[PDB]
Amino acid sequence: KPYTVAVSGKTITVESPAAGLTIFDMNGRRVATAKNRMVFEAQNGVYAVRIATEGKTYTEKVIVK
Amino acid sequence: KPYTVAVSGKTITVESPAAGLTIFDMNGRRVATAKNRMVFEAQNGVYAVRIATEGKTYTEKVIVK
Ligand SMILES: [Ca+2]
Ligand SMILES: [Zn+2]
Ligand SMILES: [Zn+2]
Ligand SMILES: [Zn+2]
Ligand SMILES: [Zn+2]
């Protein structure tokens, strides 16, 4: 839900605002991390994409006229 | 960042996947709450939009070939 993950070619693209992102390879190795978004060039194989959302609270002021 | 908030006419539209949304009026009253998104019809005045993201961790399996 609060992220997108997609693969095209060898490219894994991950988008998740205010989230810590991690990609693990099959050996459980952290091959990349980034906040918010990532474009990872992978090799053939299976990967685990981890999205850790930060769980903050935000407030916005809105004026209705 | 992990949400959008916009007022158009008397309509307040809020979008934030996996989040608890709240709108408070000027008296501090909860006038609406929803998961993930809402379309609120307001009266003239000032509103506080609160976005409480859930802070969960997600994992997706990705295959590169
Ligand atoms: Ca409350
Ligand atoms: Zn490691
Ligand atoms: Zn090593
Ligand atoms: Zn770790
Ligand atoms: Zn921080």
Numbering used by the authors:
A (entry chain B), B (entry chain A): 672 to 736
Give the article text.
The virulence of P. gingivalis is dependent on secreted cysteine proteases called gingipains (RgpA, RgpB, and Kgp) that are essential for corruption of the host immune system and acquisition of nutrients and heme – a vital growth factor and source of black pigmentation of colonies on blood agar. Gingipains are synthesized with a typical N-terminal signal peptide targeting them to the Sec translocon and are exported through the OM via a novel secretion system referred to as “Por Secretion System; PorSS” or following the naming convention, Type IX Secretion System (T9SS)7. Translocation of gingipains from the periplasm across the OM is dependent on a conserved C-terminal domain (CTD), which appears to be important for secretion of the proteins and in particular, truncation of the last few C-terminal residues of this domain leads to accumulation of gingipains in the periplasm.
The structure was solved to 1.9 Å resolution and the Fourier map enabled us to trace residues K672–K736. However, a significant difference was observed between the polypeptide chain encompassing residues V717–V735 corresponding to the s6-s7 loop and the last strand (s7) of the CTD. The equivalent region from the neighboring monomer then occupies the space generated by this movement in an identical manner. This domain swap, as a consequence, generates an antiparallel β-sheet between strands s6 and s7, as occurs in the absence of swapping, that has the same backbone and side chain set of interactions, with the only differences being the monomer that provides s7 and the conformation of the s6-s7 loop.
